[model samples]
Target: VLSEGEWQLVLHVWAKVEADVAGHGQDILIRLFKSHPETLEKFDRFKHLKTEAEMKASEDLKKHGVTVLTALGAILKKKGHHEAELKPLAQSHATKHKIPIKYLEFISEAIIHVLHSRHPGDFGADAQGAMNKALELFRKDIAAKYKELGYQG
Candidate 1:
């Protein structure tokens, strides 16, 4: 759990980008795909986007990005009281989707990278650390669900 000050830092910085969650979410995923191309294969909807330009222009990709950020928004909205949302998603990924747990960490890295690059002034070390902690906590919640479902990857 984030401290009061840390939550403030995280939420304050998040608000700066929340105006265009779709755009920023796409940017984050594009960055993730660029850094870790293997993850692209996991996304049936977006795996077809082979190039950066294609990803940027793909409405499907943009919509999926919104989906991702919306979940993140929900998580933050409840200040990490998000088991209702994340548990089922994690169960699906573990059983049907077959996504590796490490990908969640990769997405967190992409999120930090995009946030810092886009809002360099606001996302300094403090905000970055707070966001990192928030995402790590979120990842733990999902990973625990994955474990409970008997997927050990």
Candidate 2:
């Protein structure tokens, strides 16, 4: 999904983001889930925390943050060549967690939004469409696997 040059450009941009994922990942996840309230329901660990403050203050919050960061970074690195890694997670969510494929797209949007907000200047003339292109590959693979399972999720 990304050209060699585009991959390099995206990798550079991603390095900056990953450097701070440990610090800001929870904040990004909370904001994303808050904006789409029902998305939190898929997680028994996260669903009980109703308020924004609770979501932020919960001790295991970092786990979700890091997981999201890990997935995004892994998929971005693989470009469109990521279904092998993505399928297991997507299928597990479909069969185990019952998280619909639509939530995969939702999470994709949240990740892209976090990237844009975190690195506004990275989207300059030099960057162009690289971020969207990479994230779309991740989103498509997740959706494809979820659909292939053909379950209610």
Candidate 3:
């Protein structure tokens, strides 16, 4: 589980992206690639495509990410679980990077920035709020998962 400070940092980054999506899609993608080049491989569908096609591809990927988060949140709500049930997914990403828990925040921030750049004006106050709510739910789930697994924070 992330500390209060860590959660705030994550939300701050997400809000920044939410504010930028309408005006700076390309910049967001550039920043994401710069920060996490490995993620480029995740976009193979758009690889070798032309500029406009690649842009659309990026937007599509961002949409998918948002959908995933939204779906996870909905699932948690339907299950009536106070904590998220998505911790395993988060842990899988962390395992892939061999990083500590903090990397999750970094990755999530990077994702928001990339999405913002790709889908500028697509996100607004409501979208950002939804993102924040989803994140909180996920983090709660992560914390519970950690405890269940006997991991030390």
Candidate 4:
């Protein structure tokens, strides 16, 4: 189990990522769900939806959101820009859902597990490097976002 501070950090990171993705669209969230189906079990909002259309719509939004974040990186490639995009959204989501930021750690772990299981040896150093790059970008973006939201941390 994670300590309270650790959990907060995890959710904080996820919230930042989610905010950045949402700026573009919701497609990123969809991709995340598709990539880690088990994530649905982790959140109550996604647990009860029964219709495929509903599910698909949610997924599409998330995927689009992710695409926007990708575009943001392509355009700015600056950590500040990334942080400016994520912070407020993270705060809002965290407050509204009463969910700790640490949940993001689980999400990250789940994604790694899924990728490893699906690709096995296919993920080499290049893949790891790419993942690290993406995460660094995410962290930079989230930090700026938090600043914009008047968050000191």
Candidate 5:
């Protein structure tokens, strides 16, 4: 669970980027793919893109990024009460996408990387720590959902 100070810090930085979900989301996804090229295989829409330039130009990529960011927004808004939003998302990733839990770490780090790079002052060590804690909880929730759904991978 996140402390009160952590909640404020996370939300404060989150507010600055929330208005541009599609923009920031795409950047995060780009960072993820750049860091872990194999993750591209998880996205049919982005799997064929040969370069970062192509990814940035793809409307499909933007839309998917928006979807991802929006889901994260949902998780952040409710904080501890994220089960309603988190469960279904986790279910899809587990059963439909067949994504393993380890992939979550890549995306989580991608989020932090994009946020910190975009707003260095706002996302300093304190804020980064808070966000990391939040993402840890988010990952646990997803893992729990996978267990409930009988997803071994």
Candidate 6:
């Protein structure tokens, strides 16, 4: 659990941008795919897209980005009390997609980066730290089922 100050910090910044979480979320996903195009290999539809323009234009990919962002926006609440919220996605990646964990971690960095850039004054070190912590919590759940279980999927 985050301390009172840290919780407030995360919540403050989150609230600042909740209304536009959709655009921010989709932007982060686009940035991630552009920065790490190899990661796009995991998505059959995205695999063929070569540029940010192409990625950003795709309706399906955009919705996915919004969905992911929406989920993370929800998880960032309550001192981030719901790491368990990631369990289903964790299991899906482990047993179905078998997506490498690196890409998951990569998008998180993108999320934090976007948040920081969008609200520099609002998201300071402690807030970024809490975000990083939230992301690590999200990362660990899938890490275990995939890394430890050795892709039994």
**Backbone collisions counted per model:** 0, 0, 5, 27, 0, 0
Top candidate when judged by lDDT against the true structure: 5
Query: Distance from true position, residue 145, model 6, in Å?
Result: 3.5
lDDT of 1 by residue, 112-138 (tens): 999988999999999999999999998
Pull out the clashing pairs in model 5: none
Give the per-residue lDDT digits (tens) of candidate 3, residues 1-153. 344544454444444544644334444444555575655555565454445446555666556455444444344343335434465564654444243444445555754555554545645555545555555656556655655655424
Full-model lDDT, candidate 3: 0.50
Candidate-wise lDDT, in order: 0.87, 0.74, 0.50, 0.47, 0.89, 0.77
Candidate 5 lDDT tens digits, 30-144: 9989999989998887788989999899998989889888888878978678878887899889999989888898999999999988999999999999999999999898998
Candidate 2 local distance difference test against the native: 0.74
Model 3 per-residue lDDT at 116 = 52
Candidate 2 lDDT over 1-153, as tens digits, reads 578888887888788888888656787778768888888877788878888889778879878788778877887788667767787877777788887766766666676677677778775544547766776676666667766678634
Best by TM-score: 5
Best-first order by lDDT:
5, 1, 6, 2, 3, 4
TM-score result, candidate 3: 0.43
The TM-score obtained by model 6 is: 0.85
- What value does the lDDT take at residue 20 in candidate 6? 84
TM-score of every prediction relative to native: 0.94, 0.85, 0.43, 0.40, 0.95, 0.85
Question: Sorted on TM-score, highest at the top, how do the candidates line up?
Answer: 5, 1, 6, 2, 3, 4
C-alpha positional error of residue 22 in candidate 5 after TM-score superposition, expressed in Å: 1.4
Shift in Å, residue 3, candidate 5 = 1.2
lDDT tens string, model 6, 21-64? Answer: 66787788788887887877788877878777887788888788
Compute the lDDT for candidate 6. Answer: 0.77
When 1 and 2 are scored with TM-score, the better candidate is 1
Q: RMSD of candidate 3 to the true fold?
A: 8.1
